[PDB]
Ligand binder design. Sequence first.
Ligand code: 3PE
Ligand code: ADP
Lengths: 63, 97, 99, 54, 47, 459, 52, 344, 319, 120, 39
Amino acid sequence: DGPEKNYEKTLAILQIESEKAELRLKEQEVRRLMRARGDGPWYQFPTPEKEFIDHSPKATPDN
Amino acid sequence: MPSTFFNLTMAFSLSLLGTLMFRSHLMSTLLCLEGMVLSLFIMTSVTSLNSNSMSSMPIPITILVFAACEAAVGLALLVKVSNTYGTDYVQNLNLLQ
Amino acid sequence: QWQEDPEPEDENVYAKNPDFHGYDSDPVVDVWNMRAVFFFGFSIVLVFGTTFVAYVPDYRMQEWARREAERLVKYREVNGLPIMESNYFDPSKIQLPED
Amino acid sequence: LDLIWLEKTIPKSTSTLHTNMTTLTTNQKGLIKLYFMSFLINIILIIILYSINL
Amino acid sequence: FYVREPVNAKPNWLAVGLSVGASVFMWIYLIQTHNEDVLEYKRRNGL
Amino acid sequence: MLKIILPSLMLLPLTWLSSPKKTWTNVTSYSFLISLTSLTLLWQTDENYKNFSNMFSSDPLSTPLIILTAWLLPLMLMASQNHLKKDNNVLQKLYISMLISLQILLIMTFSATELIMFYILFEATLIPTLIIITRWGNQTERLNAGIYFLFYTLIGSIPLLIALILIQNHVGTLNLMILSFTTHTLDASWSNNLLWLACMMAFLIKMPLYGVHLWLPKAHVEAPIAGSMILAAILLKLGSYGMIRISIILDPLTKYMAYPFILLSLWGMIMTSSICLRQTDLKSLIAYSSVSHMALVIASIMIQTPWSFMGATMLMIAHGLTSSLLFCLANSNYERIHSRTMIMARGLQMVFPLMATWWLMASLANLALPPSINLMGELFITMSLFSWSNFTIILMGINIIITGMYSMYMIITTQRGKLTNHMINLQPSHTRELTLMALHMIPLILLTTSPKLITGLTM
Amino acid sequence: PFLDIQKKLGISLDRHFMFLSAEQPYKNAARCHAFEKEWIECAHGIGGTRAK
Amino acid sequence: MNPITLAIIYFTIFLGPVITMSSTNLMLMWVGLEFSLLAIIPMLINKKNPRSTEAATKYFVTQATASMIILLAIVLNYKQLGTWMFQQQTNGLILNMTLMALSMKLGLAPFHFWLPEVTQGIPLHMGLILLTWQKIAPLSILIQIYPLLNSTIILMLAITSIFMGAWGGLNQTQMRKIMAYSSIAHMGWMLAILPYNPSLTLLNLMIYIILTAPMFMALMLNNSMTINSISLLWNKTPAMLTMISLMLLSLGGLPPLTGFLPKWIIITELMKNNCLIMATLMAMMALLNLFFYTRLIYSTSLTMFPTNNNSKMMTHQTKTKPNLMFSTLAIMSTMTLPLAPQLI
Amino acid sequence: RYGLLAAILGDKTTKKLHEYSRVITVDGNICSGKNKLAKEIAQQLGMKHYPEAGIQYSSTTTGDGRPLDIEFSGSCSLEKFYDDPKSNDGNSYRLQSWLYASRLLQYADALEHLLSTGQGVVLERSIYSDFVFLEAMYNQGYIRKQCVDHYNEIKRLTLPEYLPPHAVIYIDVPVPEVQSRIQKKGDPHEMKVTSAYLQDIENAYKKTFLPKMSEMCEVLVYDSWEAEDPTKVVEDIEYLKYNKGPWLKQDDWTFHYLRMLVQDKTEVLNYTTIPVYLPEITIGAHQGSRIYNSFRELPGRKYAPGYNAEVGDKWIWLK
Amino acid sequence: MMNGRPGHEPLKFLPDEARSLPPPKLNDPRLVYMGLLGYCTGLMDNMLRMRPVMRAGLHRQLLFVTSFVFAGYFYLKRQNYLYAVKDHDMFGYIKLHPEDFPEKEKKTYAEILEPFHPVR
Amino acid sequence: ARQWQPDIEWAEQFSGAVMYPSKETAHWKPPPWNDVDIL
Ligand SMILES: CCCCCCCCCCCCCCCCCC(=O)OC[C@H](COP(=O)(O)OCCN)OC(=O)CCCCCCCCCCCCCCCCC
Ligand SMILES: Nc1ncnc2c1ncn2[C@@H]1O[C@H](COP(=O)(O)OP(=O)(O)O)[C@@H](O)[C@H]1O
């Protein structure tokens, strides 16, 4: 079919590979940030649930 | 408890040093093994009691119930050994080399 | 001593099948395993392949470049430009470090 | 240089280095006391590894 | 044939029907899931 | 490039499904045509590389090989129809499939864009090869040879695995296209000086360097003829193809980190060439000939001058074809003689007139006779090496004199002199033996007519 | 935890009694109940890395 | 075994890991570990051979003291935080105890002496359970607590295990112990990535389970505990020779097969985290593991060892078949590599 | 198939046992007339009679049942045993080892019939009474000491698992007598039997076999005259009390596992193929591979029972 | 890692959110692979059990090729979701915390001066 | 000439409770095949 097809196909292959590469690196930076920051949905480690804290009126008066 | 929980803890380590260095009779280990469960039971009960954490007292006993059976299994192995070798001595247990 | 076969002899396949072509013992398989190997081997790979490879046109552009040179050498010489100027990327484009 | 010196150095030596290392690590009495004591040593070292790097 | 009649002399006809029939239930659920899926996907997003 | 590959895979179904009597012809006839489809890749009408698709690419360096890899499967299956014709009809169909997978894997490795695709496929080729060498190897020592072939490659391989994962983190993709059009300049640290060694060492091992080449003499000795052809023609060149595509990165260090290897190779070229001079096993001599003529290649893929590279590409394709031819004829003598010894079997031309002509042309290809791509190759590596340092001609000059001596000695003590009195009478030559040869040399004559196709990426 | 068959099934056989501020029998409040609450309603929605 | 007992035991051996995994109250995690200890001991002595009693008595003492150490960690935590569960604040020594203890139950590194010996005296079947459905429990406890454990220790236990496993395996000729040694090694890789990416531990385990379970049902198909015994595989059952070959090379990291992925992604994750020191040394001796795997390959497949005339007799008789699981777990294991992206 | 599932739901051996569900093995010398007696004993009490297990007791039991070629059946000749004692190739030991494997198959097949049907079994000579031939062979130049150790190792590994013979009817025609019987018989080879062999065999019966199984199982020895009259012996067998014997502890849940063993022939003789490389036993890889490719290619054998079309199996495409 | 995310379904296979993603084409090379992976399992089984390799269990062969494939569509459907969550999560963060991921500027090759190491 | 299949002697080495026998380790003997001991 021609020189046109491979040149344009190779540029499309490079754009996919360039864009995949930028994203893979950004992942590693985002993943460094959320681990230490803990300010993002990943690496949100658990602590007890307040759904068990008993807020009832207790017997002593200082609960 | 600040230093009364260090005696119990060292008791568990002295019992730890025991179970880990065998000498002759296997029973002495098992027996030692139990010395730890007592120390754990005492420490768990102690802190639960001075934290007034009654919701946790179930544990001090669950620890004993599981530990008792654990020991039951341990002794049946022991009886099995002095039925196959006429002694509980550990040296005998060297066939798997 | 343990049990095992004695080393087998290698047959003179040329004793029977005196037309042995080296592919298989029974004769018809042999004939049909060379009639298809000389053919697919030589007759339509070394011949049709070399035909096609010979006719690949201007492989890697080296048939194109002996003309583009000729019109560039035609154009550069007649207009008086240097045939191969000494810098390729123009100096103007290049912002050199100013230090 | 071929055969002996270039076979004793790279290909054979690496053969021996390991062979010998397996011989010491795998020659075990099979007795429990010995093995267990090694558990003791480990606890001690790890206790320290934490201690010194507190 | 066999002195000890092979246990496999005649097919376990249950094993055919739960093996054949099971697979045909798998597909009819699988192909259904896909077209059904495509739809939801298409409509869930604009189209 | 999935016609050079998918139709290949389908060969496996054909080797298995086909009749025991007709299995050989279906497989050999079809892969001859598989080679014909491979020839389509040669149609490059512009300098831009043909990126077939994301994972599969073919540039001037890979294309000359993919065709050779497809070409030898037919030949390999024709050279092993004799031995392996004493098998149980399921050992054959395994050997045929093993040979088929080698070029499927090798075609992909030579036609791979992602460098780690190279690694996974690169180190996979050992599985098929080790089976071919160990399972069907005639001598008692193939278990040993197999171990040597697996460990030398494997210990080199894990460093490359760490290095390539390392560059992916440093750059962000192992895609040979991008890595080329992106700025990866090592910084001559002590660490980088290690990275460079990590990437090149795995390739330098399967391309026997003087220091680590003991695996190749041992492997080809007991390997069956098909395995020895694959190791010499395609397997060793996997290391060269890797060094060409990996040194696109690690651009600055090889200027000064190459001296060690270059000197190892050129002195190695002389000693490996010389021990060929007195080695009693013919397969042994061809193997060391292969080490020396491959030591020239690692000394051109490191000088890194345009001419070196295509000197390398010329020699690798050429020596690949020549070596097999030598290993193939060595086998024909071995099967009738039943011994690898060079001293026995003297005078064969007296009894096998033509095989001797093939022996003569193979030797003239082995030494550098001039209207041959083999000479063009060495002439070019020689030139650049001279440019690197005029003194190099001395060492690349002792090799040429020695290479002439052992190449002709193989002809003089195997195919001339008085006939051996009465070894098991030597049955005449089969037409398969002769074609298997003709199929090797007719392409050597045709390629020498138009060397441009195998010139490499540089030119 | 590793396999949350408890939340899924909705059952709470193991969660009701993990902290000192959990329901104590006869509502006899524990000690430090004045704080653990304050230290777990704080760390709720904020992951550990930022509960620390 | 009175089939009722078989049920109670098997239920416990199965309720044992499951309680561990499901619960969050560590205590309930400890008793899950305790039930596994109690359930496994009866099965271990089923033959009741003199070797067996030795096996169980060692397994039990090693398991019991570790169980007590894990409990001590929970008891100590209870006093450093009222909670019954490890938290960010946990004293470092508290967690390290749990690592050592749990690394004893799993048998990693310098505590790797019990496993090879118990794997040698138990049947091939109970060998599998002792190797793979008893590693799930402790690992669960670790994977849950990963954010908090030490990167240094794990790595040391990881590297040690890899070495000990490899070196031990080279000399061994008993198959049960070759597998025990491999498990120590693979267990090592698993614990190496725990601090960094627990999700990969769960891959390096499944793949180990999908590799070892077929491998052992292979060893027992002919019930061969010797390599010499597995070497005559060619006469007893020829077909399994092909897959036994690939599964063992898969157990080691060779690239075309599924076994490369766990090592490859663990190395990718460690380099992403910068351990290019540690990862390199691990991968290198990992190559030692393949040497002993291939030595077995040699004996069983690539070379045909001499057999006994009495074997012709065993051929005559129909060979009881290998369960279907063998196939489905042999293929999904030997070749899934083309599907790696979705696995991780 | 028989398995826990079946056992769980009925299929219990205990429920299927009865006065005559027993194992009676009658053992004697080269020719003790024991076949006749065994046959009758079995008939009178209504029990299955298992023929003596020869070099071919396995091909008959497996597949066509047609006598396999000698090399397929382990290349053992009792005939060559006699004409060439202390042979260079050791056909005599190979004969003995194949014989032990054959009775192992026969005893296991017998136990499978006993626990399934419930019918008893008369097995003539058994794994328990095979050692006398080897003892006599070692007492003679027939077998060397290690050869003996290899048989003993196989015996110790496999024989204990199977339950002992309930009773072991025995005949005792003396060596002089047997030699006479053999000679009267036409077998050209059997007649070359050294008298000493006969004696050594007899001794190992009396010095070892009868006392050794006497405490673990009932022993009923009869002389030539007694045996000619099976009825006489049948009486004794009936008045047997089977009081002692490890058989007493075989509860149903214990039998199940034994049944599942005999149910699996590949295991019964698993330890018969142990990789101990004494030279006589070794087939050798090249010879062994050929014998295999050839035994496995016999019609109906190239694929599992039920799947090979050569013999007329059908429905393979759905099995 | 991705666990602990807001809204996480504690024990669910593929949350309905995954409905938004395109369904895996049944002929996706991967599902087709799983198919072949399956056929082979079947063939292998026949072999290990000593049955005519291809002409037997033609019902089983189907169960296999159709069990593996069934599994695939529903697995891939998920793994595809997991990956898709990863972007939602990743891309979002890049924005919510923009400064940390600034768009640096790249100069034309004219301005940049890369050292030239001669090959000579 | 046929590929050398391993003879008895090549096989022998793989017997013994340890492949590479040590000074004192060699003194050991292979484990009983039945997994049951004579003591
Ligand atoms: C491709 C990558 C590598 C693959 C290797 C394996 C491939 C095997 C399968 C394919 C084989 C054929 C295809 C590959 C080779 C193709 C060779 C070819 O196409 O020859 C071209 C030639 C016409 O020449 P042309 O291409 O126009 O030359 C350019 C001039 N500007 O066409 C011709 O004229 C053919 C003429 C045939 C007769 C030639 C007679 C002269 C021979 C001179 C020999 C000199 C001495 C050689 C010594 C060798 C060592 C002893
Ligand atoms: N283990 C053995 N070793 C050698 N010969 C044996 C063995 N077992 C049986 N035989 C032979 O089998 C032959 C047939 O046995 P038997 O039934 O006693 O003779 P018959 O069938 O004439 O009554 C005997 O002559 C005996 O020598």
